[PDB]
Design a protein around this ligand. Structure first.
Ligand SMILES: *[C@@H]1O[C@H](CO)[C@@H](O[C@@H]2O[C@H](CO)[C@@H](O)[C@H](O)[C@H]2NC(C)=O)[C@H](O)[C@H]1NC(C)=O
Ligand SMILES: *[C@@H]1O[C@H](CO)[C@@H](O[C@@H]2O[C@H](CO)[C@@H](O)[C@H](O)[C@H]2NC(C)=O)[C@H](O)[C@H]1NC(C)=O
Ligand SMILES: CC(=O)N[C@H]1[C@H]([C@H](O)[C@H](O)CO)O[C@@](O)(C(=O)O)C[C@@H]1O
Ligand SMILES: *[C@@H]1O[C@H](CO)[C@@H](O)[C@H](O)[C@H]1NC(C)=O
Ligand SMILES: *[C@@H]1O[C@H](CO)[C@@H](O)[C@H](O)[C@H]1NC(C)=O
Ligand SMILES: *[C@@H]1O[C@H](CO)[C@@H](O)[C@H](O)[C@H]1NC(C)=O
Lengths: 321, 160
């Protein structure tokens, strides 16, 4: 007659690692590493993202004619831009503090567009000839839609003096620019006055830009260049513009809604008509696992990211036949 | 194992005991059979469950990468940014992997210790009334039946 003490055993094939020994087969284990995603870009808790497709953030904000899809985008959860969107600055040039503006976007969920300076408000200047073959639309020369490339009228460019007061509750993102002609002859043909500038002033901003008339290689058929600026006009503050030429004046600006909590995700995927609580640039994640090794740049309620290929915890004991 | 029981003085496991992690296998007149020890088994289950939860909860403040862009003349800060984010990802990946490795080892020794202590508890019970075969089994001198067997597991076993 006997009584023996013993331990469980099964047909488990699960394996775990330890410092002194690898691949120890155990009776029970627990995988804690999520390794799959759905390969799509979904809505984040019901809110759809802003998929810029072939337009860059600048193409969208300035109003590149090829970006009409985003003239009035609604509230978004996160933003997706491609690595190299073809539609950005149709007329060649530079966008000042572009990366800082993009970073600012990353902390907002909505840009409501409003008209701060009617295009019909320019009575002593040509506000219709400001176009270029570099920004085509419906087979003809056009231009960024949110700003105005002002031209001289009746062989004159009387000095401009415009002021705008932010009577809204939200911070206002204002964009404007200046044109750098290719030579003196061009300066005279477009603005008449040879020596010009664009001065802008708010309670905090002080600036005066001058055109740098030079000749350069052709980009999108143009050897001229546009230089764009931006500032945030606080509620109740006013912005003053003065210029005797080369001014690319604002028309539309954006009211900023800091519902705060966004991100500019780099991806070539399009919208996958799905909903998730955790999104990576490669696809969504839906799991209870504490960890995941999909991608490090995620948004929403997600598992912790690690580079591990395998992460299994032992729960049961060593499985001995 | 560290406590020498599992795959030790008790050479193998019992495929026939599906009632738990540790238990007994008796043999008398009436018959034989396996019976998992619910006390120690459950005590182990609670311990492992708390361990898994602790591990997870301790990995709730890990670093989180944030997307930023830099222009052509900001290569130094872009690299500083990249080295920093990779830096923390490598640290937490190390933390996750090492913690699992170390605890997995402790989990195996934990089970080993439980078996060893269950065995020793029984050994103390069957003071001089049983013979230690040294294989995890005890052979009684004078016959012992199902009521007697249940007595040991009952933890009530005692001449008193
Ligand atoms: C923008 O317009 C607002 C509204 O007219 C100006 O603020 C008001 O200014 C008057 C006159 O000084 C004050 O009596 C009111 O108390 C102000 N109201 C508010 C909303 O504060 C404001 O000065 C203008 N902004 C600038 C910088 O010119
Ligand atoms: C469980 O422990 C009890 C003592 O607490 C052991 O004693 C017997 O218990 C049963 C009830 O399960 C009684 O009917 C018997 O009369 C008790 N022994 C005698 C003959 O006095 C019991 O053996 C242990 N295991 C079981 C359930 O048999
Ligand atoms: C505002 C204006 O005059 N637009 C004209 C421009 C400008 O002269 C240059 O862009 C200045 O750099 O030149 C064009 O060849 C072009 O761009 O398509 C014709 C166009 O009508
Ligand atoms: C035995 O192992 C096989 C393969 O993993 C499994 O499908 C089967 O359910 C196991 N037997 C039991 C305990 O049912
Ligand atoms: C561990 O086991 C796996 C089984 O898939 C095998 O691929 C791996 O090479 C093993 N590692 C060791 C310690 O050899
Ligand atoms: C995740 O999967 C579970 C199980 O099917 C489901 O109940 C839940 O709705 C899913 N979550 C999402 C947003 O995919």
């Amino acid at each position: 007659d006997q009584i023996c003490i013993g331990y469980h055993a099964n047909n488990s094939t699960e394996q775990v690692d330890t410092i002194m020994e690898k691949n120890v087969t155990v009776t029970h284990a627990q995988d804690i590493l999520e390794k799959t995603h759905n390969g799509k870009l979904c809505d984040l808790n019901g809110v759809k993202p802003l998929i810029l497709r072939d337009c860059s953030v600048a193409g969208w904000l300035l109003g590149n004619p090829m970006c009409d899809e985003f003239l009035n985008v609604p509230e978004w959860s996160y933003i997706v831009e491609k690595d190299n969107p073809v539609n950005g600055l149709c007329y060649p040039e530079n966008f000042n503090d572009y990366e800082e503006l993009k970073h600012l976007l990353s902390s907002t969920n909505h840009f409501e567009k409003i008209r701060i300076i009617p295009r019909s408000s320019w009575s002593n200047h040509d506000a219709s000839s400001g176009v270029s073959s570099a920004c085509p639309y419906n087979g003809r020369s056009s231009f960024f839609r949110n700003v105005v490339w002002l031209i001289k009228k009746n062989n004159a460019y009387p000095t401009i003096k415009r002021s705008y007061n932010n009577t809204n509750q939200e911070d206002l993102l204002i964009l404007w620019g200046i044109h750098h002609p290719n030579d003196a002859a061009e300066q005279t043909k477009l603005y008449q006055n040879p020596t010009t500038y664009v001065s802008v002033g708010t309670s905090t901003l002080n600036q005066r830009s001058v055109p740098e008339i030079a000749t350069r290689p052709k980009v999108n058929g143009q050897s001229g260049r546009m230089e764009f600026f931006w500032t945030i006009l606080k509620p109740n503050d006013a912005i003053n513009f003065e210029s005797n030429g080369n001014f690319i004046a604002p028309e539309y600006a954006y009211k900023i809604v800091k519902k705060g909590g966004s991100a500019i995700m780099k991806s070539g995927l399009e919208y996958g008509n799905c909903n998730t609580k955790c999104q990576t640039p490669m696809g969504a994640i839906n799991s209870s696992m504490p960890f995941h090794n999909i991608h490090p740049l995620t948004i929403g309620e997600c598992p912790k990211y690690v580079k591990s290929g395998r992460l299994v915890l032992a729960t049961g004991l060593r499985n001995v036949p | 194992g560290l406590f020498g029981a599992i795959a030790g003085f008790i050479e193998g496991g019992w495929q026939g005991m599906v009632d738990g992690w540790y238990g007994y296998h008796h043999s008398n007149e009436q018959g034989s059979g396996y019976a998992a020890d619910k006390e120690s088994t459950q005590k182990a289950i609670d311990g492992t469950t708390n361990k898994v939860n602790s591990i997870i909860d301790k990995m709730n403040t890990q670093f989180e990468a944030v997307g930023k862009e830099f222009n052509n003349l900001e290569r130094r800060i872009e690299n500083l940014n990249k080295k920093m984010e990779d830096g923390f990802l490598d640290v937490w990946t190390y933390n996750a992997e090492l913690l699992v490795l170390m605890e997995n080892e402790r989990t195996l020794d934990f089970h080993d210790s439980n078996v060893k202590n269950l065995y020793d508890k029984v050994r103390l019970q069957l003071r001089d009334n049983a013979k230690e075969l040294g294989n995890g089994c005890f052979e009684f001198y004078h016959k012992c039946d199902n009521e007697c067997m249940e007595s040991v597991k009952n933890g009530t076993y005692d001449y008193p």
